[PDB]
Amino acid sequence: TKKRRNNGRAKKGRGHVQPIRCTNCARCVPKDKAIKKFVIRNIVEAAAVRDISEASVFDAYVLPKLYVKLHYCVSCAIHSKVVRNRSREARKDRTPPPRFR
Amino acid sequence: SGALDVLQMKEEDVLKFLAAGTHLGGTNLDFQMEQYIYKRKSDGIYIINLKRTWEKLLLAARAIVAIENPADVSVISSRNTGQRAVLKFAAATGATPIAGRFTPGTFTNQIQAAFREPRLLVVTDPRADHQPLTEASYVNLPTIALCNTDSPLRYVDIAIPCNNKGAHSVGLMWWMLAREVLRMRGTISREHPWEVMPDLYFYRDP
Amino acid sequence: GRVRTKTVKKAARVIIEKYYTRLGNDFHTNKRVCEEIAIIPSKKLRNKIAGYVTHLMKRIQRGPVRGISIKLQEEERERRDNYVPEVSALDQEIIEVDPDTKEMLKLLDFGSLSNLQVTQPTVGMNFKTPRG
Amino acid sequence: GKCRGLRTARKLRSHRRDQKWHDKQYKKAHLGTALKANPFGGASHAKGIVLEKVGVEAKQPNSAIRKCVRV
Amino acid sequence: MQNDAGEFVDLYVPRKCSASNRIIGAKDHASIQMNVAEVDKVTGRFNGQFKTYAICGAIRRMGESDDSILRLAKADGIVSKN
Amino acid sequence: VRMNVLADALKSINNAEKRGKRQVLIRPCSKVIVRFLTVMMKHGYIGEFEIIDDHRAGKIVVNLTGRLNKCGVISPRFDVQLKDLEKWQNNLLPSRQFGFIVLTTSAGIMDHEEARRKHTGGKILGFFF
Amino acid sequence: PLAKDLLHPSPEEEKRKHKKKRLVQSPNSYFMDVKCPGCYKITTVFSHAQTVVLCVGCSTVLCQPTGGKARLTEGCSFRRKQ
Amino acid sequence: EWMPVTKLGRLVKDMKIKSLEEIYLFSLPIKESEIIDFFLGASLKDEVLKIMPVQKQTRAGQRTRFKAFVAIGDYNGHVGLGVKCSKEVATAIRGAIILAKLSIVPVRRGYWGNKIGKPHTVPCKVTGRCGSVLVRLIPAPRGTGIVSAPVPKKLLMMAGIDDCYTSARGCTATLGNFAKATFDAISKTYSYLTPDLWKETVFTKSPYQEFTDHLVKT
RNA sequence: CAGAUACCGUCGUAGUUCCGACCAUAAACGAUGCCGACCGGCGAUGCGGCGGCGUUAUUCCCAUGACCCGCCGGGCAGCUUCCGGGAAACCAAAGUCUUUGGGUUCCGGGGGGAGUAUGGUUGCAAAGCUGAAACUUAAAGGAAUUGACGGAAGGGCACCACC
RNA sequence: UUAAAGUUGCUGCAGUUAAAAAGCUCGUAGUUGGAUCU
Ligand SMILES: [Zn+2]
């Protein structure tokens, strides 16, 4: 029987949505079915944030960042533990998790 | 107040209403409560009509007075802004208070320790203490509720349009209900004002 | 670990609630009065009631506790609740109304009220939270 | 929904007699292909001549040998 | 309810709702019968006599019990007009 | 599209006795609606109603009592001889004591109890109880 | 809800509704009376007017059409007909 | 010995309420079975309708309880229907007889054709439903009996209906749903507005209001 | 890898791309025919129209844009609810249904044999449309519950577990 | 063979998940058609 109300998708009122790959599995999942994720992290890992600054010939040199957008599939997102199975009543709550610390 | 000039709103009571702020509702409106509204100003706050408010107190005070046994009214608050205002309303009137936590089954489970059977329920905030409301609908209880603009009118019977968020505006509404119940009864009447100050009914923050 | 079961805590709560005048802070004189008040099957339970009582009497100086109710606090809360000020907080000579509130009072024929001091209304219609 | 006019009896009478054919109790008694397949031909009884006594085995959860006769 | 002889064949005659004329059932426990006192005309004290309203449980579950008791009091002349 | 204006104007007043309302609006009105509504009113089922005249096709506001259980239309308007009225008022009515079938005879839109007296058949329009 | 008054809607309740969903269909338009300042004539113009309305005398524009309401040009004042 | 724990029990035990129809008129709930024993009592009769074993799977087998469906009532009067489930069948039967006494409703009985004598049948056509079982009752002429299945026939005879036509759609083999649908149909006899119940209601005092001065002595 | 004629990795014809013909099928799905009326709320959103404080830009004015606060109409949706339905899951339609009738098309009749055989028709073919019976079975099945199981997760524990 | 069979359904069934709504749209016949005249 119908487990989701939007069929696990965001298609509401169009016929076809374009297919994109997966980043890991490379599986053609449609665009509103891919688990999406935007990462904003520093390009050098935070252990080497002191030693990049001592070797800086510039003063107060800013740290550039990585901006990639990740479209995981449905199968390999739950394998990679980026998304999980929830309860039948937690399934209806589509609010983002509390990342702000 | 059926066009009776003895029961009409006087000049001092409106000063009390405006000093406490009972006329200032929330930032939403239930569709049941659009009858009691005057208008929405800027910054969203609905202005509760006060000739409508004074007629719902005097309807509710007739309801409380028309009960013979004064200890059959059951007076309930769960938020702490109306927990002093209820023990002092029930002290001067004669009613039975449940201030604090209403454990469910108080009106249904006849085996329980805290079982009682009221003839009329007065609650303070139908959003908050809904559990005495839905439990009234098993045992045939009419219901007054001191209602805000965004507070839903299911199972209430005569809901007074007040501002039940501010601590002064709750205590003043309980004070007015106590005053009108005592005045419409046989006790000390409409000439001299009530010597019980309305600041007795307010909420004391540490 | 060392958690006290419902027997120790229930017995300690009733023996605080009934005999608060005799109990103090010393565990030893608490034990000497907990074996004269109550009939406890003996010592290894008697010293556990008297130890939670000695931990529970120190908890009463710092305020009320959410279980038991003793009549040295519940007279002080009673005299704290029957407290009226001298001049009430609703006796303000200058009370502030909006423009539109004065119109409602004029509908209720209270435009002749003298204490009302109408404020300047807010210039912007900005009250909703910034969604997104 | 069903048609519901007042001149719609030919749509009604002929939808039923096509829909009657999907009834297997109807079809097995009106098609004629299961009365030429019946060994009797629509008699209650019939007579024959015994060829041999073949005894055939019971089905799954219970065991015996049902004694039959080849007619 | 009556035969030809005029006698009454009923266990009881149930009360209908004051708002909507629906029969309040026997096991309809969400229903109300509410008494509202009448005041004296010149001093405003409790006269003794009251007005009675009955509200069926389906109306009260709808939330239309506030504006039914009110406009039944406005027709009996307890709430002042407007 | 709107086939049968009397059908939509009776399920408008059926759906509002459910929801507990005291007034319906039923646009548009024909004069078969006003004859049918006057038969329900004369048997105490409805109460007073007002015909709003815009120049197009009127609307009706009907004040409701709480007395109508069901209001219905028969489609198509089958022809009913008087010797076949008992089957109709046994299929459609809840008892032999109350409830009426409205049929349009050549003597006027009437009940089934009136059509029995004036000895008339007609076409069945609907029923109410 | 559940006791409105459909025979007598309030005059703000009438003006909120669609022009076909009112109790009687009232149009939402009018005929204005535009006065060009550079001339002295009077030319009756529909409010929700389509393609442009020229004066006969000065032969200039009065109102170019828009989506709903024809906007007057600058200096053209108007006084609404009755 | 009975010690009443409600206001209604203290009123009934002290003879202050003279019928069951006052408790029906003011629509009050009944929480003590000895009120029904006080009023109807020696004229009530019960029948167990079905004893149903139900089985919860555990890790150590199956745990078995037994539900009992008990119909009850007074012929010419009232009817109840109770379901209790327990580990013992006698305990289930006794709890089900208590539950069937507490769910006692009055049935309205009318006439088929002419109104001569006493009522015999249903007043109109009422229906009643419980999970894909419809039951419809139809009024019948004087003397046709209950024309129905055997399981609603016990309830209709215990009600005091003497004659009635019936029809049931749905999976009527599940006896609890078929019992709980004809009970629902004979509950709607007293919530159906026929034109003799169109007279405006004259209100009287509730039992809790009429005896509010005796109820503070206790 | 026991075995791989598969998963995995490296090459790689037809194809994947363009145009002229054919094919006419899909989990072609909202697994939900179209037209029409009545029936609860709430906040957003897209397009168009109307009214309104007050902020920006076109230097100031008008007009327009960008906002802000509403209202109306039609859209894709969402939350919510004892409207009512339903076997339930759930649906503001899957409601207005034994209190059964607004108009109208298609189409189902226990599970198999079987979308098979045959016949006709369409097509270069692949196939498409239309479409049985003999026999064979007492169940196949839908929702939901309680365990049990998981090479599904989160947590927790034990030297009859490990370190 | 008839009732049971509201399991052929005009009265009176069904079609999201149990058997089942044509991929979509246009369209002739059929079927059905808004107020209004004493
Ligand atoms: Zn993947």
Alpha-carbon distance of E75 to F14, in angstroms, equals: 27
> H91: domain CATH number?
3.30.160.20
Q: Does G76 show up as a binding residue in the annotation?
A: no
Q: Return the amino acid letter for E66.
A: D
> Distance (Å, rounded) from C-alpha H164 to C-alpha B70?
51
- F95: nearest CB among H124, H193, H198: H124
> Is residue F46 within 8 Å of F62, Cβ to Cβ?
yes
Is the minimum distance from the CB of F89 to strand I below 7 Å? no
Residue B35 φ/ψ, nearest 5 degrees: -70, -30
G58 marked ligand binding residue: yes
Please compute Rg for chain F using Cα positions: 14
Fill in the DSSP letter of residue H201. Answer: P
Measured CA distances, A8 to A96, F125, G65, H19 (Å): 16, 50, 48, 61
User: What tokens does F110 get?
Assistant: 């009437």
Number of H helices, E strands in chain C: 5, 2
Beta strands in E1-82 (DSSP E): 32-39, 46-55
Radius of gyration of chain B (CA): 16
Cα-trace Rg, chain E: 16
Instruction: Confirm or deny that G63 is annotated as ligand binding.
Output: no
- Phi–psi pair at H19, nearest 5 degrees: -155, 170
Could you write out the DSSP letters of every residue in G7-75? SS--HHHHHHS-TTTSSS---S--EEEEE-SSS---EEEETT--S-EE-SSS--EEEE--SSSPEE-TT
Q: Do chains F and H touch (3 or more CB pairs under 8 A)?
A: yes
Q: What residue in C sits closest to B54 (Cα-Cα)?
A: C108
Q: How was this structure determined?
A: cryo-EM
Sequence-distant contacts of G7-15: CB under 8 A, at least 24 apart: G7/F50, G7/F52, G7/F61
Chain F residues within 8 A of D3 when measuring between CB atoms: none
How far E61 CA lies from chain G's nearest CA (Å)? 14
Query: How buried is H145 (Cβ within 10 angstroms: 0-12 exposed, 13-18 middle, 19+ buried)?
Result: middle
Give yes or no for a contact between H30 and H102, defined as CB atoms under 8 angstroms apart: yes
Q: Are C57 and C22 a contacting pair, CB within 8 Å?
A: no
Whether the CB of H173 is less than 7 Å away from nucleic strand I comes out as no
CB atoms F96 and H193 under 8 Å: no
Q: Which of residues 7-66 of D touch strand I (CB under 7 A)?
A: 8, 11, 15, 19, 22-24, 27-28, 31, 33-34, 37-38, 59
- The answer to whether the CB atoms of C81 and B204 lie below 8 A apart is yes
Report the DSSP pairing between strands B96-99 and B73-77.
parallel
Q: Chains E vs B: touching, with 3+ CB pairs under 8 Å? A: yes
Q: Which residues of B touch E (CB under 8 A)?
A: 1-4, 6-7, 32, 35, 55-56, 59, 62-63, 65-67, 137-142, 152-159, 183-186, 189-190
Rounded distance between C-alpha atoms, residue C132 and residue C128, angstroms? 12
CA B36 to ligand 1 center in whole angstroms: 57
Q: Which residues, 6 or more positions from B189, have their beta carbon under 8 angstroms from its beta carbon? A: B183, E43, E45
Q: Would you call F3 exposed, middle or buried from its count of C-beta atoms within 10 A (0-12, 13-18, 19+)?
A: exposed
Q: Give the separation between CA F38 and CA F48, rounded to whole angstroms.
A: 9
Judged by CB atoms closer than 8 Å, whether chains meet at E36 and B66 is answered as yes
Distance from the alpha carbon of residue E47 to the mean position of ligand 1, in angstroms: 81
Contacts 24+ apart (CB under 8 A), G33-41: G33/G78, G33/G79, G33/G80, G33/G81, G34/G62, G34/G63, G34/G72, G34/G76, G34/G77, G34/G78, G35/G76, G35/G77, G35/G78, G35/G79, G36/G60, G36/G62, G36/G75, G36/G76, G37/G75, G37/G76, G37/G77, G38/G75
Spatial distance between the Cα atoms of G14 and G28, rounded to a whole number of angstroms = 12
Q: Provide the edge-to-edge strand list for the sheet that holds G77-78.
A: G43-46, G31-35, G77-78
- Determine the structural domain holding residue A14 and report its residue range: 1-101
Parse chain F into domains and list their residue ranges: 1-68, 69-129
3-state SS assignment for residue D42: coil
Residue of F nearest to G7 (CA): F61
Number of folded domains in chain G? 1
Number of domains in chain A: 1
What six digits make up the tokens of H135? 């039951």
List the chains bordering chain H where 3 or more Cβ pairs fall under 8 Å. Answer: B, E, F
Which of the nucleotides lies closest to H168 (Cα–C1')?
I98
Verify if strand I has an atom below 7 Å from the CB of F101. Answer: no
| Å between H163 CA and nearest CA of chain F | 14
Q: Domain coordinates of chain E in residue numbers?
A: 1-82
Look up residue C119 and give its DSSP letter. Answer: P
Q: How far is CA B13 from the centre of its chain?
A: 16
> From residue E13, how far is each of F59, F115, H22, H122 by CA, in Å?
39, 34, 10, 16
Two tokens at F33?
């609606």
Long-range contacts of H124-129 (CB under 8 A, 24+ apart): H124/F94, H124/F95, H124/F98, H124/H192, H124/H194, H125/F94, H125/F95, H126/H185, H126/H186, H126/H188, H126/H189, H126/H192, H127/H185, H127/H188, H128/H181, H128/H182, H128/H183, H128/H184, H128/H185, H128/H186, H128/H187, H128/H188, H129/H181, H129/H184
Contact at 8 Å (CB) between E3 and E57?
Answer: no
Distance from CA of H53 to the nearest CA of B (A): 29
CA of D13 to C1' of J8 (A): 12
Nearest CA among F5, F2, F42, F25 for reference residue F126: F5
What is the C-alpha to C-alpha distance for residues D33 and D20, in angstroms, rounded to an integer? 17
Q: Do H203 and E15 touch (CB under 8 A)?
A: yes
Best CA proximity match to F57, nearest among F86, F94, F29: F29
How far apart are the C-alpha atoms of A96 and F77, rounded to whole Å? 60
Cβ burial of H110 (10 Å; 0-12, 13-18, 19+) is: buried
Q: What share of chain A is helix, strand, coil (3-state, %, to 5)?
A: 15, 20, 65
Residue pair F29/F10 in contact (Cβ under 8 Å)? The answer is no
**Per CA to C1' distance, which residue is closest to J34?**
F2
Which residues have CB under 8 Å from H117's CB, separation 6+? E3
DSSP alpha helix (H) spans, chain H = 7-13, 21-25, 33-39, 89-102, 150-159, 175-185, 207-210
How close is the nearest chain F Cα to the Cα of D2, in Å? 12
Cα end-to-end distance, chain B, whole Å: 40
CA–CA distance, E59 with E68 (Å, rounded to integer): 9
Rounded Cα distance, B123 and B131, in Å? 10
Q: Which helix (H) or strand (E) holds E70?
A: helix E66-73
Say which DSSP state B66 is in. T
CA distance B64 to B57: 10
Residue at F31: amino acid letter: K
List of residues 6+ apart from A29 with CB closer than 8 A: A19, A20, A22, A71, A73, A74
Q: Taking a C-beta distance cutoff of 8 angstroms, is the pair G22, G3 a contact?
A: no
Query: ∠ CA(H141), CA(H144), CA(H149), 5° rounding?
Result: 120
- Residue G11 φ/ψ, nearest 5 degrees: -70, -20
- How far is it, in rounded angstroms, from Cα B120 to Cα B130? 15
Distant-in-sequence, close-in-space partners of G34: CB < 8 Å, separation ≥ 6: G42, G43, G44, G45, G53, G62, G63, G72, G76, G77, G78
Separation of D48 CA and I114 C1' (Å): 36
Task: Give whole-number Cα distances, H151 to C124, H43, H99, H183, in Å.
Answer: 73, 22, 19, 11
Sign of CA dihedral C66, C69, C73, C75: positive
In this complex, do B110 and H6 lie within 8 Å of one another by their Cβ atoms? Answer: yes
Whats the size of chain F, residue-wise? 129
Q: Which nucleotide is nearest to H127 (CA to C1')?
A: I98
Q: Where are the alpha helices (DSSP H) in B110-166?
A: 131-134
